[PDB]
Design a protein around this ligand. Structure first.
Ligand code: SF4
Ligand SMILES: [Mg+2]
Ligand SMILES: [Mg+2]
Ligand SMILES: [Mg+2]
Ligand SMILES: [Mg+2]
Ligand SMILES: [Mg+2]
Ligand SMILES: [Mg+2]
Ligand SMILES: [Mg+2]
Ligand SMILES: [Mg+2]
Ligand SMILES: [Mg+2]
Ligand SMILES: [Mg+2]
Ligand SMILES: [Mg+2]
Ligand SMILES: [Mg+2]
Ligand SMILES: [Mg+2]
Ligand SMILES: [Mg+2]
Ligand SMILES: [Mg+2]
Ligand SMILES: [Mg+2]
Ligand SMILES: [Mg+2]
Ligand SMILES: [Mg+2]
Ligand SMILES: [Mg+2]
Ligand SMILES: [Mg+2]
Ligand SMILES: [Mg+2]
Ligand SMILES: [Mg+2]
Ligand SMILES: [Mg+2]
Ligand SMILES: [Mg+2]
Ligand SMILES: [Mg+2]
Ligand SMILES: [Mg+2]
Ligand SMILES: [Mg+2]
Ligand SMILES: [Mg+2]
Ligand SMILES: [Mg+2]
Ligand SMILES: [Mg+2]
Ligand SMILES: [Mg+2]
Ligand SMILES: [Mg+2]
Ligand SMILES: [Mg+2]
Ligand SMILES: [Mg+2]
Ligand SMILES: [Mg+2]
Ligand SMILES: [Mg+2]
Ligand SMILES: [Mg+2]
Ligand SMILES: [Mg+2]
Ligand SMILES: [Mg+2]
Ligand SMILES: [Mg+2]
Ligand SMILES: [Mg+2]
Ligand SMILES: [Mg+2]
Ligand SMILES: [Mg+2]
Ligand SMILES: [Mg+2]
Ligand SMILES: [Mg+2]
Ligand SMILES: [Mg+2]
Ligand SMILES: [Mg+2]
Ligand SMILES: [Mg+2]
Ligand SMILES: [Mg+2]
Ligand SMILES: [Mg+2]
Ligand SMILES: [Mg+2]
Ligand SMILES: [Mg+2]
Ligand SMILES: [Mg+2]
Ligand SMILES: [Mg+2]
Ligand SMILES: [Mg+2]
Ligand SMILES: [Mg+2]
Ligand SMILES: [Mg+2]
Ligand SMILES: [Mg+2]
Ligand SMILES: [Mg+2]
Ligand SMILES: [Mg+2]
Ligand SMILES: [Mg+2]
Ligand SMILES: [Mg+2]
Ligand SMILES: [Mg+2]
Ligand SMILES: [Mg+2]
Ligand SMILES: [Mg+2]
Ligand SMILES: [Mg+2]
Ligand SMILES: [Mg+2]
Ligand SMILES: [Mg+2]
Lengths: 231, 137, 208, 148
RNA sequence: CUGGUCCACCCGUGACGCUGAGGCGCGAAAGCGUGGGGAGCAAACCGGAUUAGAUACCCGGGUAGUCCACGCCCUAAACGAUGCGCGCUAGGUCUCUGGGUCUCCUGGGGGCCGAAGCUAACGCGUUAAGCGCGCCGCCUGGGGAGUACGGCCGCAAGGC
RNA sequence: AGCGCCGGCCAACUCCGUGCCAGCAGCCGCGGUAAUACGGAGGGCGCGAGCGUUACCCGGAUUCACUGGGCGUAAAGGGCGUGUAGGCGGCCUGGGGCGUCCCAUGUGAAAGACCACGGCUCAACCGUGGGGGAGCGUGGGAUACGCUCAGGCUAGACGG
């Protein structure tokens, strides 16, 4: 499922803005840029993909977490492929530790999923009506993938654990496996199942994400091949 | 430097709090006889006599507990506490009858005796007292 | 001397029957059946949360008022139990039950500890064959506590031992009715009594 | 189920234009009398909610505290900033020797016999936290040789 | 004319070290003694305003003194309110000054932000207020009072 | 059969009287016309031939901190150097055996204390037995560390 010629997308970056705790996954500092060693990645993917495949094999649920620009749309696709919950735009504080309370915003969502599912009564003030069509969109803008998350997840798969320290901190507090792909600017000790590598190259973000999702399909029966590897 | 022994107890203390794999100690015979105790008792994986920038040192190989769950995954320490007792400013000598038990036996006490460097349990076995070098648990 | 005052207000304050009268304590006339609230003006006012010093003081007055013993002796006997070997709670109880006047009561020669004390102070009780008129005399394993010869022909211990024929005295004790003598076999264990007291709180009281 | 004890209730105050407006703080330990204890601090605008809120958090902050015939396995000292608790194991016939705050914690953990002593700031809250962290660091022979 | 200090080479001595009660020296300003100097400035002081007052702030004047030489005084928010020495415990950024193979690597300083850890908190953090050892100084409720008595010092003020 | 106490600490509360008065008070504090805090009364709590008070010692007081504290801003770094005495001191080999550790032995009176048993009816009181030390004298032994003496080293320190 893995590769060895994945070294043709990323092998690391981020020039001397590093976290010293990451040095045990760094091979050399060449063009001003810290270069990640992938023999450290290959062993680690063996751990992570051992965890991911074994997790879906028993009915798990991985909350995929991506927020930044270079990983915005790709995390939407890959989580929808495996039918997995994603958080796309903003990570709402408490989403995990205050789950039974933010989930109270998807019930309001399903409400406007029924209301604007013709008709209940649309014959109630259009102002009072189009008031809601904006509240509808907003809920979809932030709860589009979290809605399928009906219960506190079994693990989370984040794109950037520094950029997403809030989500990590909550999951760590709930004894939730924190699995993540991370480059030279993050804390290995905070990640339960690590994937050392670039998290800014879309050419690399999609790679370790798209063919990680592929592994999730084969663990819940049957395979599919093509996912969006847009150029 | 004024107390080579307290320096080594402290080099290790500082090394275990940042979870270093190893830490070098300036080499001496009395320090071997103390690291001899620490390894056999499980507190360290052991040591080897090495050479740093031409000078004899002692690479001490440390040890830690399992990775823990929750916030702060950092593992519990195997050496929780390693404390100088007898100091150049105040020597501490106990006869055999007043050798302390460290943490109700779940810890050790290293002493220097005319029969060599022993643990507290080793001292009463040989029936001798000595100079309380340190307590460890 | 000992407390020679009203006795039902004692149980009423402690909130549990302290069988300190004998007959009356098993009739509907027992004042703990009728009014089970503290004596005096404010008994029927609803109680507040007592302090933990109150909880321990109350457990320690209960234990002391059971044996009708002065605080001086009750504390004296506590301190012997304390400095003794190990388990203080058991020893304080055992040394308390070792008192002669108490043993007279447990044997059934008397219906109440107050009466038991008087049976001794008036000489009607002997220990191993000698008049021993001391309420605080320490009975030990082996002794034979009896009724004096010039006493065995007296209404009170005759009637008292009668109803004792119907009673089964504590295991650590022995009783030969009609001979009017008993034996102290061994000082009681912990569970030999179900005294309405948590003696661990009494230790807690004096450790302050 | 578990058993609760209210160590501390107290009234605090904030100010605004108009005068002082009060809050209530509840410091409650909950135990199993057989090795489970928890400590919780619950603050609310009225006394019952806080007393009930603290018992909630308590049930979600428990410690193993491994007894040994009613006593702790080894002597321990913990500082929680200026507050300091000392705990020493003690034989059977001795009792629980502690002030009210650590007593409520040890007695709800099933500790029947121990010697304690508070030092420095005997501030109940910080003493309570320091007592919990002391129990949290209790080790057994099977705990330590497994580590070594 | 003279001190300190850093760096390169790794050439010499072979533990010759660290701290340091006493001692001794240095010690901002102001002040003191004897001469000298005196533009500006300016305690005191005089005047003009302001004000209920205005022994002030504001204005116009102005003597010590501020300056020099020598001899005293020895105080301070004399502060980083942080004693000295040594070893150990992530890094990022800016700067001064050395050395190299001149990306940078490496020393010795000066700042900022921060790991672990410390702290009552504020904050400290390889320039520790972290982890350790040595030695010294010092604290032990506020006011009385840094006063009194005594002693030592000083020309005095006054200092210890 | 009495004495103290019933606002919190701290165990025990109501009515009257008083109205910043009279008074209470170990500390925090009570009394200004509805006082569980003053005075009496009822009731209640604690002890009991006692109960209270004053004085003083130890404790709580890790508040002189050996066990077992501190000094940026809470009280606390000497204004700074230099240096006497003194405290303290790197790596390696050995000689001694001062410290230190061990073994043996002498001393450590009786009484007291503690444990067992017994005599005064119990107890207090008292008899009989048992068990110990530390410290010092002496004899034997150990030599890791501290000490000393001797020899070697170069990592500290100093010099070119
Ligand atoms: S009659 Fe009832 S209330 Fe009175 S002393 Fe006996 S048990 Fe107690
Ligand atoms: Mg990034
Ligand atoms: Mg000795
Ligand atoms: Mg009667
Ligand atoms: Mg006591
Ligand atoms: Mg006491
Ligand atoms: Mg355990
Ligand atoms: Mg502290
Ligand atoms: Mg505190
Ligand atoms: Mg205090
Ligand atoms: Mg206080
Ligand atoms: Mg050389
Ligand atoms: Mg040479
Ligand atoms: Mg001067
Ligand atoms: Mg001047
Ligand atoms: Mg002059
Ligand atoms: Mg002039
Ligand atoms: Mg004028
Ligand atoms: Mg004027
Ligand atoms: Mg005017
Ligand atoms: Mg005028
Ligand atoms: Mg002027
Ligand atoms: Mg002028
Ligand atoms: Mg002029
Ligand atoms: Mg300055
Ligand atoms: Mg100062
Ligand atoms: Mg100094
Ligand atoms: Mg400088
Ligand atoms: Mg620098
Ligand atoms: Mg931190
Ligand atoms: Mg400290
Ligand atoms: Mg802060
Ligand atoms: Mg800051
Ligand atoms: Mg900082
Ligand atoms: Mg730095
Ligand atoms: Mg002073
Ligand atoms: Mg003073
Ligand atoms: Mg002065
Ligand atoms: Mg003076
Ligand atoms: Mg004078
Ligand atoms: Mg001074
Ligand atoms: Mg009283
Ligand atoms: Mg009292
Ligand atoms: Mg009360
Ligand atoms: Mg007094
Ligand atoms: Mg009136
Ligand atoms: Mg009023
Ligand atoms: Mg009135
Ligand atoms: Mg009063
Ligand atoms: Mg009073
Ligand atoms: Mg009154
Ligand atoms: Mg009497
Ligand atoms: Mg005192
Ligand atoms: Mg006490
Ligand atoms: Mg003291
Ligand atoms: Mg004092
Ligand atoms: Mg100390
Ligand atoms: Mg202090
Ligand atoms: Mg100050
Ligand atoms: Mg200074
Ligand atoms: Mg001075
Ligand atoms: Mg010297
Ligand atoms: Mg020396
Ligand atoms: Mg030495
Ligand atoms: Mg000797
Ligand atoms: Mg003796
Ligand atoms: Mg004697
Ligand atoms: Mg005797
Ligand atoms: Mg004797």
């Amino acid at each position: 499922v893995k590769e060895l010629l994945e070294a043709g997308v990323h092998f690391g970056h981020e020039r001397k803005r590093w976290n010293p705790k990451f040095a045990r996954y760094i091979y050399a500092e060449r063009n001003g840029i810290h270069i990640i060693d992938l023999q450290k990645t290959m062993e680690e993917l063996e751990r992570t993909f051992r965890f991911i495949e074994d997790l879906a094999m028993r009915g798990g649920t991985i909350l995929f977490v991506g927020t930044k620009k270079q990983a915005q749309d790709i995390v939407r696709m890959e989580a929808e492929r495996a039918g997995m919950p994603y958080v796309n735009q903003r990570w709402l504080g408490g989403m995990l530790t205050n789950f039974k309370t933010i989930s109270q915003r998807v019930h309001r969502l399903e409400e406007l999923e029924a209301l604007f599912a013709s008709p209940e009564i649309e014959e109630r003030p259009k102002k009072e009506q189009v008031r809601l069509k904006h509240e509808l969109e907003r809920l979809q803008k932030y709860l589009s993938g979290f809605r399928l998350l009906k219960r506190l997840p079994d693990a989370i798969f984040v794109v950037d654990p520094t950029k997403e320290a809030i989500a990590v901190r909550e999951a760590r507090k709930l004894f939730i496996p924190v699995i993540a792909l991370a480059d030279t600017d993050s804390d290995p000790d905070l990640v339960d199942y690590i994937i050392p590598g670039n998290d800014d190259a879309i050419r690399s973000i999609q790679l370790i994400l798209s063919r990680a999702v592929d592994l999730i399909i084969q663990a819940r029966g049957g395979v599919v091949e093509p996912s969006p590897s847009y150029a | 430097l004024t107390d080579p022994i307290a320096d080594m107890l402290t080099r290790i203390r500082n090394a275990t709090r940042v979870y270093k794999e190893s830490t070098d100690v300036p080499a001496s015979r009395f320090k071997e006889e103390i690291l001899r105790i620490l390894a056999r008792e499980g507190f360290i994986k052991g040591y080897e006599r090495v050479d740093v920038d031409g000078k004899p040192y002692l690479r001490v190989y440390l040890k830690y507990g399992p990775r823990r769950q929750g916030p702060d995954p950092r593992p519990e320490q195997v050496i929780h506490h390693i404390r100088r007792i007898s100091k150049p400013g105040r020597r501490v000598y106990v006869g055999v009858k007043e050798i302390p038990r460290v943490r109700r036996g779940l810890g050790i006490a290293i002493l220097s005796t005319s029969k060599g460097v022993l643990t507290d349990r080793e001292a009463r076995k040989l029936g001798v007292g000595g100079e309380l070098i340190c307590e460890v648990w | 001397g000992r407390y020679i005052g009203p006795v039902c207000r004692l149980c009423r304050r402690e909130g549990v029957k302290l069988y300190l009268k004998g007959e009356r304590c098993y009739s509907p006339k027992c004042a703990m059946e009728r009014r089970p609230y503290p004596p005096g003006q404010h008994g029927q006012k609803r109680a507040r949360r007592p302090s933990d010093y109150a909880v321990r003081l109350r457990e320690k007055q209960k234990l002391r008022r059971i044996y009708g013993i002065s605080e001086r002796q009750f504390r004296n006997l506590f301190e012997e139990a304390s400095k003794k070997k190990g388990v203080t709670g058991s020893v304080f109880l055992g040394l308390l039950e070792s008192r002669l006047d108490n043993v007279v009561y447990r044997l059934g020669f008397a219906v109440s500890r107050r009466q038991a004390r008087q049976l001794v102070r008036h000489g009607h009780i002997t220990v191993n064959g000698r008049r021993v008129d001391l309420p605080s005399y320490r009975v030990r394993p082996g002794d034979e506590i009896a009724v004096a010869e010039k006493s065995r022909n007296l209404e009170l211990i005759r009637q008292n031992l009668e109803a004792m024929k119907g009673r089964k005295v504590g295991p650590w004790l022995s009783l030969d009715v009609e001979g009017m003598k008993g034996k102290f076999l061994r000082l009681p264990d912990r569970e030999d009594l179900a005294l309405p007291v948590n003696e661990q709180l009494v230790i807690e009281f004096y450790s302050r | 189920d578990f058993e609760e004890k209210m160590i501390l209730i107290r009234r605090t105050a904030r100010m605004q234009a108009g005068g002082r407006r009060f809050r209530f703080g509840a410091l409650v330990v909950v135990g199993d009398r057989q090795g489970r204890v928890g400590l919780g601090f619950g603050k609310a605008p009225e006394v019952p909610l806080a007393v009930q809120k603290a018992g909630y958090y308590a049930r979600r902050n428990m410690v193993e505290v491994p007894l040994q015939n009613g006593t702790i396995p080894h002597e321990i000292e913990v500082e929680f900033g200026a507050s300091k608790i000392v705990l020493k194991p003690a034989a059977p016939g001795t009792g629980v020797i502690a002030g009210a705050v650590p007593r409520a914690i040890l007695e709800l953990a099933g500790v029947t016999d121990i010697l304690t002593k508070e030092l420095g700031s005997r501030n109940p809250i910080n003493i309570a936290y320091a007592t919990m962290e002391a129990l949290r660091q209790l080790r057994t022979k099977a705990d330590v040789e497994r580590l070594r």
